[PDB]
Amino acid sequence: TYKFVNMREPSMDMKSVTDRAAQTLLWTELVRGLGMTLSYLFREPATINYPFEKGPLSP
């Protein structure tokens, strides 16, 4: 069993072409990436306070 990763064909009707042009001229995916980074900013960091805190170990 195998999968195709990049075998899609964009639709050439007027609405989809207009959507792609709006993405180009208004940078929608760039704001999407900005928003994901912003959401990542507002969560707790994963940093521990060494040497007062230590990483987990095992026997």
Binding site: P45, A46, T47, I48, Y50, P51, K54, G55
Partner: protein, 156 residues
């Protein structure tokens, strides 16, 4: 007297400034570089100590040798060390850099990076954990804090 008090306080200030901002350039030779990048990861966050990530050779305070130094590579490491400004420190990370380690009896491996450059801190392990390298960096900070230059200049 006040003459030695002034130089003592100036030493304290300069040492605090030097150790509170250590800019390392890392020789990611081998697998110990992976533990360096894990010490730079969110969990340990070297940057939170003032230790920035991947400084340039012309503006680096400390050199981290993390990997096996081969005979083909020794001149490049020595040249990069010579290009570094002073004061400059070297940290030897892992068995390969400390003494050759698993490849000590090899025809193409330098038996320890201290045959090429002087070393300030030796971090043992194969590889040392990110916590171990952080401990070595903090020990280098303490070593810098201990040092005294204006006092040596004053009493000489």
């Amino acid at each position: 007297s006040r003459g030695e008090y002034v130089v003592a306080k100036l030493d304290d200030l300069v040492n605090w400034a030097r150790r509170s901002s250590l800019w390392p350039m890392t020789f990611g030779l081998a697998c110990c570089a992976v533990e360096m990048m894990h010490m730079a990861a969110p969990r340990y966050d070297m940057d939170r100590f003032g230790v920035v990530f991947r400084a340039s050779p012309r503006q680096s305070d400390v050199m981290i040798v993390a990997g096996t130094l081969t005979n083909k590579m020794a001149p490049a490491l020595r040249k990069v060390y010579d290009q570094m400004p002073e004061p400059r420190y070297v940290v030897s990370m892992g068995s390969c850099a400390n003494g050759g380690g698993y490849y000590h009896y090899s025809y193409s491996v330098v038996r320890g990076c201290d045959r090429i450059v002087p070393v300030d801190i030796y971090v043992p392990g194969c590889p040392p954990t990110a916590e171990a390298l952080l401990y070595g960096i903090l020990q280098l900070q303490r070593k810098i804090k201990r040092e005294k230059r204006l006092r040596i200049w004053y009493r000489r």
